Design an enzyme around this catalytic site. Structure first.
Site, PDB file in Angstrom:
ATOM      1  N   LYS A   9      52.409  35.404  58.468  1.00 45.75           N
ATOM      2  CA  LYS A   9      52.552  34.845  57.151  1.00 45.75           C
ATOM      3  C   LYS A   9      52.704  33.328  57.165  1.00 45.75           C
ATOM      4  O   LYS A   9      53.126  32.726  58.159  1.00 45.75           O
ATOM      5  CB  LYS A   9      53.759  35.454  56.431  1.00 45.75           C
ATOM      6  N   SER A  25      39.370  34.415  45.571  1.00 44.56           N
ATOM      7  CA  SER A  25      40.040  34.348  46.871  1.00 44.56           C
ATOM      8  C   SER A  25      41.143  33.275  46.841  1.00 44.56           C
ATOM      9  O   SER A  25      41.305  32.567  45.826  1.00 44.56           O
ATOM     10  CB  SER A  25      39.014  33.987  47.958  1.00 44.56           C
ATOM     11  N   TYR A  58      41.953  38.059  48.980  1.00 44.17           N
ATOM     12  CA  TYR A  58      41.491  37.855  50.358  1.00 44.17           C
ATOM     13  C   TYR A  58      41.448  36.365  50.694  1.00 44.17           C
ATOM     14  O   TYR A  58      41.365  35.504  49.804  1.00 44.17           O
ATOM     15  CB  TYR A  58      40.114  38.519  50.587  1.00 44.17           C
TER      16      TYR A  58
END
Lengths: 118, 115, 118, 115
Positions: A9, A25, A58
């Site tokens: 992350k 995205s 994404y």
């Protein structure tokens, strides 16, 4: 059995300006993707610490060194420039591997200055 | 380990139909499914650009050439006719393959004309 | 690559009375589980056609022939007795198998009377 | 084919801490993780019985015996101290195994006393 584990992350990055539209995205400086182990076209969860929204989209790569974090274009409703977010990817693996798995974590401050720790 | 990757998407298609009587799916022109690699009965995510709603359902085929995007059942609560949406599917594969994976993307303008 | 496919669903079942609390799960007549191919403890998505809510939980079996559909107990906030819902499970499989996969679908009317077609 | 099954859960634990400064995870007494089979860094779903919110994050271990359930980061927007929640994790396995799969469930009363 197969576990779903935090792969990595980007912790508390800030959403930036970007000229380009990113078509639903989140565009992310390739350097940041590298540090978190996130791939272009990988599914990502974004948790907006500022407004509390949680969404999934994404990743796409932004130019290395641009420090861009952008949902400009079709994803603009879930985050705004200045908002602080956490961007995570999750991977699957057998339970044994899961039990000693170490996520790839990058921490951010300031002008999306990246650090290995907090 | 195994990654979840964007398999493909229909970018900014327009919802043409939205009935709240069966079947809870999104019916999509087969030509569109073909371009995006999306399968009948595949899980799909739908991101409504118009109203901001984000939800998940599954795809079924509509008649080839119809240029239909039909959000049926309970999903009819989340999109109306004329809304602009993105429809995406995701697949998993080993990390090694995911590093070179390329999604299947179709772009649209006007009334669901594919570029 | 591996696809996520609709395994099966219970189409337009009605949420019923039930005396027992089900601890966050949805309890479902074993006969209905059989027809949709859904397993006890399987993850399920529930789409509430009446109020538009969409949530995910897990299935537990109710007594065969009870015709119970219940989120009584800890999941009571997402559906109410009388509400019409669709309950789906999703499975993964290789793309080739996915391309000729046929979901297990059960249709409902009336007093949760089950039919093979609509 | 491959099923998604409930691996385990913590049933009706109470949120003890909720800070909006790092890390976006839920920290859980290791004794609790042990009982439910939930791993550090595992994806988890959290269903708030008190306010009805449903969200997903990942687990980290809190000090054994502390009986802490701490919802941190952005997740602090979705639960407050004193809220009753269910924390669950899901795993995948072949259909054949899923038919006999049994989840790991822990029940609680009072102030996070495990039964």
């Amino acid at each position: 059995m197969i576990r779903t584990m935090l792969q990595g992350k980007l912790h508390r990055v800030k959403v930036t300006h970007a000229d380009l539209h990113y078509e639903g995205s989140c565009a992310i400086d390739q350097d940041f993707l590298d540090a978190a182990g996130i791939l272009e076209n990988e599914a990502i969860d974004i948790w907006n610490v500022t407004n509390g929204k949680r969404f999934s989209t994404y990743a796409i790569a932004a130019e290395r060194g641009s420090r861009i974090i952008s949902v400009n274009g079709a994803a603009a409703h879930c985050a705004s420039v200045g908002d602080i977010v956490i961007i995570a990817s999750f991977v699957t693996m057998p339970d044994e591997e899961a039990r000693t798995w170490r996520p790839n974590v990058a921490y951010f401050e300031g002008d999306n200055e990246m650090k290995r720790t907090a």
